[PDB]
Design a protein around this ligand. Structure first.
Ligand SMILES: *[C@@H]1O[C@H](CO)[C@@H](O[C@@H]2O[C@H](CO)[C@@H](O)[C@H](O)[C@H]2NC(C)=O)[C@H](O)[C@H]1NC(C)=O
Ligand SMILES: *[C@@H]1O[C@H](CO)[C@@H](O[C@@H]2O[C@H](CO)[C@@H](O)[C@H](O)[C@H]2NC(C)=O)[C@H](O)[C@H]1NC(C)=O
Ligand SMILES: *[C@@H]1O[C@H](CO)[C@@H](O[C@@H]2O[C@H](CO)[C@@H](O)[C@H](O)[C@H]2NC(C)=O)[C@H](O)[C@H]1NC(C)=O
Ligand SMILES: *[C@@H]1O[C@H](CO)[C@@H](O[C@@H]2O[C@H](CO)[C@@H](O)[C@H](O)[C@H]2NC(C)=O)[C@H](O)[C@H]1NC(C)=O
Ligand SMILES: *[C@@H]1O[C@H](CO)[C@@H](O[C@@H]2O[C@H](CO)[C@@H](O)[C@H](O)[C@H]2NC(C)=O)[C@H](O)[C@H]1NC(C)=O
Ligand SMILES: *[C@@H]1O[C@H](CO)[C@@H](O[C@@H]2O[C@H](CO)[C@@H](O)[C@H](O)[C@H]2NC(C)=O)[C@H](O)[C@H]1NC(C)=O
Ligand SMILES: *[C@@H]1O[C@H](CO)[C@@H](O)[C@H](O)[C@H]1NC(C)=O
Ligand SMILES: *[C@@H]1O[C@H](CO)[C@@H](O)[C@H](O)[C@H]1NC(C)=O
Ligand SMILES: *[C@@H]1O[C@H](CO)[C@@H](O)[C@H](O)[C@H]1NC(C)=O
Ligand SMILES: *[C@@H]1O[C@H](CO)[C@@H](O)[C@H](O)[C@H]1NC(C)=O
Ligand SMILES: *[C@@H]1O[C@H](CO)[C@@H](O)[C@H](O)[C@H]1NC(C)=O
Ligand SMILES: *[C@@H]1O[C@H](CO)[C@@H](O)[C@H](O)[C@H]1NC(C)=O
Lengths: 35, 237, 86, 366, 99, 49, 50, 34, 50
C-alpha cells in the first residue's frame, strides 16, 4: 500500500444471508400479508 | 554596592496546576462572532507550573510570570546570559514613578536587591554600567493578581500584561482572562536566563514555560476573547 | 480571478474561452431548478377552492387547510415546517 | 450587444445575459500620519570607516521619512540591484524596521551576495536567506580604502566547522583543526587561523581593489507603519465610491462612519472569510467602514428580431438609485430581482411569456 | 412540533451548498507558490516582467479551484434532478389516484 | 503525494485545503454504499423461520 | 531548483488524484441508481404480485 | 478490544445485542450507558 | 546493496533463481531482497498506518 486503505462493510455476509432467509420464509408461509 | 546575602532564604519550588491561564491576543486585528484557529507559542492547559513561596531560572522560549502580590512588593526583572558586563544585559524597573527599561553591559553581584528606608530612596542592584545600548521610560505598570507574558521573537521582546483583583487564598483562579499586548521592545538580545527583584525592608509567585501549538479562540460580540480550546489535549479537543 | 485588474484580465485573455464555458453551465443549472419546481407542483389547470361550510362526514381537516388569519395563508403544518428548519 | 454575444444576426424571443455592471470610482484619498522628520542616510553611506566583512556593521533605522529618488539617480554606485521591489516604487511604499548592513569586500565577490548563491563570502561570512527581500548597493573604494603601505586591517573568514546561518554574526577566533590531531593552541601542521587578511594596494589591478557594499532589508506589514517616503496627504471623503491608500493599504469602496467597538490597540478589523471591513485613519483615529461599490449582471428582454426591434433592460440585484445609454429611457420599475427599464407596469395578470423572477414576468403587446 | 431533526435531508442539502460556497470563497487566500496571496500588493510592489509570472501562478490556481467547484455543482444538480423526478411521479400517482 | 517528506509537506501546505474535500467526498461515497445495502436488504420488522 | 522539481511532481500527482476522485463519483452515482432499482423490485415483486 | 476493523480503546465488550446506533463496522457498534 | 526503503523484514520461503537480486509483483513494488552476505531471501512489508 501507498497511503490507501479499504474499509470493511458494516453488514457481514451472515447477516445478509439471514435477511434473505427471513424474507423467503415469510413469503413462503404468509404470502404477501407480512409486507 | 552590594554584598552576599548571608540569610539565604529558601523559596520552596512547589508544583501546582496551570489550569486555563496564559491566553493573550495574538495579533492586531479586530474580529467579532467568529471562531478563529491560530498556531503560536502558548502555555499548555492543565500542566505543572512552578510556585515559589532568589534562584536563577532559564528563559527558554517564553515565560508566563504570575504574582498574586499584595501591596506591590515586586519591583522588576533582569534578563541576560551570564548577568555580567561581558554580555548585553536588560533590566526592567517599576518603582513608584515611571517605569524604566535599560539595555546595557551591566554588572551584578550574587543577590541584588532594592531595599527601602523608612525617605524611601535606595538602589544598589547593580555594580557597574559602562556601555549602554537602549533606554526607555514609560507609565508605571501598577487581593490583586498580576500576570505577564514575555516572548522573544525576531529581535522583538513582546510583553503582554493583565491584572485582575483576586479573592481566592492560595491557588490560581479557575477563570478566564485574555492578555492584551502591552509593549514591544525593538532590540535583539540573546537572552537565556532571568531574575526577579523584591522590595525588602531595610514571597509567592508562579512561573511557567510555553510551547508551540494550535489553539481555537472564540470572539464575543465586542471582540474580546472569551473562550479557548487546546488542540492536543484530549480526543474531544 | 482578477478582482478588477486590467493586467490580470489581459493575461487571462490568452487562456481561451473558459469563462463562457463556465457561465454556460450555471445558467443551465438554474433553469433546471426552475423547471423542476414547475413540473413537480404545476399539476392542475385551475385553482379550486373549498366551500365555506365544512361537513366532511366527521373528518376534520382544519389542521391542513390554509389559515386565512395568517398573512402567509399557510396551514399549521406548513408553518411548523417553515419555522423548524433554518 | 445581444447579437454580438450570440454570434448571429437574428435573435429569437427570450431574455439573455450579456455583460455586467460596476460603478466606477470618482476621486482618490490619501491619509498618512503627520510625521515629517528627515531620515539619516548620509551618516551611514558616507561613513569614513567601514568594518570588515566578518564584522559587518549592522544598523537599524525607523521613524523617519526617506527619499529614495536622490539615491536612485546617484551615479556614485557601481552596482544597484534590488530583488523583491522595483526601485521606482520605493518612493511610493512605506515599511517598518529598515535594516542596513555595511561592509568592505573584494571586487570579484560582489556576485556572492545573492539568495541561493554559494561561494566563500556567501557561506562563511554573510549568508543571505533564499527568500530575502531588499536591495544591494556596491561601489569601488580603491581611491580611499586602499593604502600604498598595504591594508591588512581587512580580513575575511576562511574556515569553519560547518556552514553559517542566514543573518548570523561570527566573531569567534579559534585555531582550526584541519587534521586528526588537536592543535592545542599551536598554529602549525593542519592548524590555521580562520581569518585571512588582505593585501589591498592601489597598484593592484581590478578584482582586488576594495569595494564598499551596503545592503538594505525591509519587512512586509508586521507592525504599524513607521518609515514612509515623501508623499502628500489628502482629506477624507464619505459616502462616495472612491479608492484609498490608507497607510499603504490600497483599496476601492465606499467609506462609511462605523460604530464598531474597537479596543485601544487594534488598527483595522475584519469579518468572516478575512474580508477587510473596518479601518482606522492614522491622523484622526476614527473607526471607519468599507463596503464594495455596487455591481451586478445585466440582462436584455427581447420579443425577437423577427417581430420587433425594441428591448428592455434588467439590472440584477440593484436598487433603483444608481442606474447610470439608458440614463432615462422609459418609466422605471423596481422588483425583488432588481431594477427594470423599458417596460410599463400594469395591474393585469396573464400567463408567463418571458420569466423574469420573484413571480413576475414580461411580454410584448410595447 | 416536539421532536427535532425530523427534516434531515433538506437541512443536509442547505449545509452542503453553504459549505461549498464557503470553501470556494476561502480558497482566495492561498499563495499557490507565489510570493503573496493579494494581487494589488504584487502589482504595486514588484517589476512587471516577473509580476506577470506571479499573476500567472495565481490565475492557474484560482481557475483550477473554480473548475472543481463547477464539477461538484453539476453532480449535485444531477442527483437533485433524479429526486425531483421521483417526487413528481409520486405526487402524480399517489395524490391524484389510489396506488 | 509526499511519502513522509518534511520539505514536500511544507511545499504542499501553500496549496490551501485541497485535501479536506477529497476525504469528504470519499467518506460520502462510503456512507452512501452502506445506506444502499441497508435500504435494499433490511425490509423486515422481524426474523422469521 | 529541487523545489521546482518537487512542484512539478506535486502538481502532477494532485491532478491524477483529482481525476480518480471524479471517476469514483460518477461510478458511485450509477451504482446508486442501480441500487434504487433493485430496492423497488424487491419491494414490489417479492412482497407482492405485480 | 480487538475488532475486525482495528483496535478499540475506552469501551467495554458485552455479550448482549441491541439495535445499532453508532456504527463501527464488521457488524459491531457501540453505545452509551459508560 | 543500494536498494533503499522503509519496512519490516521477515523470513521468506520464496526461491529466487540463482542470479536475481530482488523481486516485485506489480507497479514496481519491491517485495523480497537477497542479502549480499548471507545470500538468503527475505521479505519486506510496510510499517503499519491508518
Ligand atoms: C546565547 O547565549 C548562550 C549562553 O547563555 C549561548 O550558549 C553558549 O553556546 C556556545 C556555543 O555552543 C557554548 O559553547 C556555550 O557553552 C553556551 N553557553 C551556555 C551558558 O550554555 C548561545 O550560543 C547564545 N546564542 C547566540 C545566538 O549568541
Ligand atoms: C565597553 O566598550 C569599550 C569600547 O568598545 C570596550 O573596549 C573594547 O573592547 C573590545 C572587546 O574585544 C576590544 O577589542 C577593544 O580593543 C576595546 N577597546 C578599548 C579602547 O578598550 C569594552 O570592552 C566594553 N566593555 C565590556 C565590558 O565589554
Ligand atoms: C458590549 O458592549 C456593549 C456596549 O457597552 C454592552 O452593552 C451595554 O454595556 C453597558 C456597559 O457595559 C451596560 O451598562 C449595558 O447594560 C449594556 N447593554 C446591553 C443591552 O447589554 C454589552 O454588554 C457588551 N457585551 C459584552 C459581552 O460585554
Ligand atoms: C378540528 O380540530 C381542531 C383542532 O385541530 C379544532 O379546533 C379546536 O376547537 C376547540 C373547540 O372550539 C378549541 O378549544 C381549540 O383551541 C381548537 N384548536 C385549535 C388548534 O384551534 C376544531 O374544533 C375541530 N373541528 C371539529 C368540527 O371538530
Ligand atoms: C555624501 O557626500 C556627497 C558629497 O561628496 C553627497 O553628494 C552631494 O550632495 C550634495 C548635497 O547638497 C549635492 O548638492 C551634490 O550634487 C552631491 N554630489 C556631489 C558630487 O557633490 C552625498 O549626497 C552624500 N551621501 C548621501 C547619502 O547623502
Ligand atoms: C433604495 O435606496 C433608497 C435610498 O437609500 C432607500 O430609501 C431609504 O429607505 C430607508 C428604509 O425605509 C429609509 O430609512 C431611508 O430614509 C430611505 N432613503 C431615501 C433617500 O429615501 C430604498 O429603501 C432602497 N430600496 C430598496 C428596495 O432597498
Ligand atoms: C506535576 O508534578 C508532579 C510532581 O509531584 C508529578 O507527580 C505530576 O505527574 C506532574 N504532572 C504531570 C501532568 O506530569
Ligand atoms: C523612580 O524612577 C524614576 C525613573 O525615571 C526616577 O526619576 C525616580 O527618582 C525614582 N524614584 C525613586 C523614589 O527612586
Ligand atoms: C498630526 O497633527 C495634526 C495637526 O494638529 C493633528 O490634527 C493630527 O491629529 C495629528 N495626527 C497624529 C496621528 O498625531
Ligand atoms: C417570424 O418569421 C416567420 C418566417 O420567418 C414569419 O412567418 C412570422 O410572421 C414571423 N413572426 C413575426 C413577424 O412576429
Ligand atoms: C392600476 O395601477 C395604477 C398604478 O400602477 C393605479 O393607480 C390604479 O389604481 C390601478 N387600478 C386601475 C383600475 O387603474
Ligand atoms: C460474556 O462476557 C464475559 C466477560 O466479558 C466473557 O468472559 C464471556 O466469555 C462472555 N460469554 C459468555 C457466554 O459468558
Amino acid at each position: 500500500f501507498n497511503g490507501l486503505t479499504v474499509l470493511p462493510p458494516l453488514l457481514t455476509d451472515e447477516m445478509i444471508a439471514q435477511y434473505t432467509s427471513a424474507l423467503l420464509a415469510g413469503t413462503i408461509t404468509s404470502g404477501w400479508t407480512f409486507g | 554596592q552590594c554584598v552576599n546575602l548571608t540569610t539565604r532564604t529558601q523559596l520552596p519550588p512547589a508544583y501546582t496546576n496551570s489550569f486555563t491561564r496564559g491566553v493573550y491576543y495574538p495579533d492586531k486585528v479586530f474580529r467579532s462572532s467568529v471562531l478563529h484557529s491560530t498556531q503560536d507559542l502558548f502555555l499548555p492547559f492543565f500542566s505543572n507550573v512552578t510556585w515559589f513561596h532568589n534562584p536563577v531560572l532559564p528563559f527558554n522560549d517564553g515565560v508566563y510570570f504570575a504574582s498574586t502580590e499584595k501591596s506591590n512588593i515586586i519591583r522588576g526583572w533582569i534578563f541576560g546570559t551570564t548577568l555580567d558586563s561581558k554580555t548585553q544585559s536588560l533590566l526592567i524597573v517599576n518603582n513608584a514613578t515611571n517605569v524604566v527599561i535599560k539595555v546595557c553591559e551591566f554588572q551584578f553581584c550574587n543577590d541584588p536587591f532594592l531595599d527601602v528606608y523608612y525617605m524611601k530612596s535606595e538602589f544598589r542592584v547593580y555594580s557597574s554600567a559602562n556601555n549602554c545600548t537602549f533606554e526607555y521610560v514609560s507609565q508605571p505598570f501598577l487581593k490583586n493578581l498580576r500576570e505577564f507574558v514575555f516572548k522573544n521573537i525576531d529581535g522583538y521582546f513582546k510583553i503582554y500584561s493583565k491584572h485582575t483583583p483576586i479573592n481566592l487564598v492560595r491557588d490560581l483562579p479557575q477563570g478566564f482572562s485574555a492578555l492584551e499586548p502591552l509593549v514591544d521592545l525593538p532590540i535583539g538580545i540573546n537572552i537565556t536566563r532571568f531574575q526577579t527583584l523584591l522590595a525588602l525592608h531595610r514571597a509567592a509567585y508562579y512561573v511557567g514555560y510555553l510551547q508551540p501549538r494550535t489553539f481555537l479562540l472564540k470572539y464575543n460580540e465586542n471582540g474580546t476573547i472569551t473562550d479557548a480550546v487546546d488542540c492536543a489535549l484530549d480526543p474531544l479537543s | 480571478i482578477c478582482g478588477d485588474s486590467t493586467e490580470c484580465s489581459n493575461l487571462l485573455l490568452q487562456y481561451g474561452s473558459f469563462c463562457t464555458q463556465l457561465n454556460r453551465a450555471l445558467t443551465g443549472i438554474a433553469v433546471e431548478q426552475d423547471k423542476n419546481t414547475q413540473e413537480v407542483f404545476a399539476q392542475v389547470k385551475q385553482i379550486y377552492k373549498t366551500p365555506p361550510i365544512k361537513d366532511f362526514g366527521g373528518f376534520n381537516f382544519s389542521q391542513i387547510l390554509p389559515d386565512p388569519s395568517k398573512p402567509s395563508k399557510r396551514s399549521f403544518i406548513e408553518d411548523l415546517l417553515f419555522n423548524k428548519v433554518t | 450587444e445581444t447579437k454580438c454575444t450570440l454570434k448571429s444576426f437574428t435573435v429569437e424571443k427570450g431574455i439573455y445575459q450579456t455583460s455586467n455592471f460596476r460603478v466606477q470610482p470618482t476621486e482618490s484619498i490619501v491619509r498618512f500620519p503627520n510625521i515629517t522628520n528627515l531620515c539619516p542616510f548620509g551618516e551611514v553611506f558616507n561613513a569614513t570607516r567601514f568594518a570588515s566583512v566578518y564584522a559587518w556593521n549592522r544598523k537599524r533605522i525607523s521613524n523617519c521619512v526617506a527619499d529614495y529618488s536622490v539615491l536612485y539617480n546617484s551615479a556614485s554606485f557601481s552596482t544597484f540591484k534590488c530583488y523583491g521591489v522595483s526601485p521606482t516604487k520605493l518612493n511610493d511604499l512605506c515599511f517598518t524596521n529598515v535594516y542596513a548592513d555595511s561592509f568592505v569586500i573584494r571586487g570579484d565577490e560582489v556576485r556572492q551576495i545573492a539568495p541561493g548563491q554559494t561561494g566563500k563570502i556567501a557561506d562563511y561570512n554573510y549568508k543571505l536567506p533564499d527568500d530575502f527581500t531588499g536591495c544591494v548597493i556596491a561601489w569601488n573604494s580603491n581611491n580611499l580604502d586602499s593604502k600604498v603601505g598595504g591594508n591588512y586591517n581587512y580580513r575575511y573568514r576562511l574556515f569553519r566547522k560547518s556552514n553559517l546561518k542566514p543573518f548570523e554574526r561570527d566573531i569567534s577566533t579559534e585555531i582550526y583543526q584541519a587534521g586528526s590531531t588537536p592543535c592545542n593552541g599551536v598554529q602549525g601542521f593542519n592548524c590555521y587561523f580562520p581569518l585571512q587578511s588582505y593585501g589591498f594596494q592601489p597598484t593592484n589591478g581590478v578584482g582586488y581593489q576594495p569595494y564598499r557594499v551596503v545592503v538594505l532589508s525591509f519587512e512586509l506589514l508586521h507592525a504599524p507603519a513607521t518609515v514612509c517616503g515623501p508623499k502628500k496627504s489628502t482629506n477624507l471623503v464619505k459616502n462616495k465610491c472612491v479608492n484609498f491608500n490608507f497607510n499603504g493599504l490600497t483599496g476601492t469602496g465606499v467609506l462609511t462612519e462605523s460604530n464598531k467597538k474597537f479596543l485601544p490597540f487594534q488598527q483595522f478589523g475584519r469579518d468572516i472569510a478575512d474580508t477587510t471591513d473596518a479601518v482606522r485613519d492614522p491622523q484622526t483615529l476614527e473607526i471607519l467602514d468599507i463596503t464594495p461599490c455596487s455591481f451586478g449582471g445585466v440582462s436584455v428582454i427581447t420579443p425577437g428580431t423577427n417581430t420587433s426591434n425594441q428591448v428592455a433592460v434588467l439590472y440584477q440585484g440593484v436598487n433603483c438609485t444608481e442606474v447610470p445609454v439608458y440614463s432615462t429611457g422609459s418609466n422605471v420599475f423596481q422588483t425583488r430581482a432588481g431594477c427594470l427599464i423599458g417596460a410599463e407596469h400594469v395591474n393585469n395578470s396573464y400567463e408567463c411569456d418571458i420569466p423574469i423572477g420573484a413571480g413576475i414576468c414580461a411580454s410584448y403587446q410595447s | 412540533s416536539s421532536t427535532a431533526s425530523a427534516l434531515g435531508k433538506l437541512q443536509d442539502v442547505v449545509n452542503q451548498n453553504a459549505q461549498a460556497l464557503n470553501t470556494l470563497v476561502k480558497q482566495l487566500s492561498s499563495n499557490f507558490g507565489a510570493i503573496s496571496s493579494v494581487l494589488n500588493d504584487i502589482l504595486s510592489r514588484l517589476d512587471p516582467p516577473e509580476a506577470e509570472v506571479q499573476i500567472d501562478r495565481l490565475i492557474t490556481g484560482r481557475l483550477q479551484s473554480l473548475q472543481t467547484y463547477v464539477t461538484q455543482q453539476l453532480i449535485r444538480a444531477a442527483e437533485i434532478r433524479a429526486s425531483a423526478n421521483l417526487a413528481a411521479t409520486k405526487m402524480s400517482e399517489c395524490v391524484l389516484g389510489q396506488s
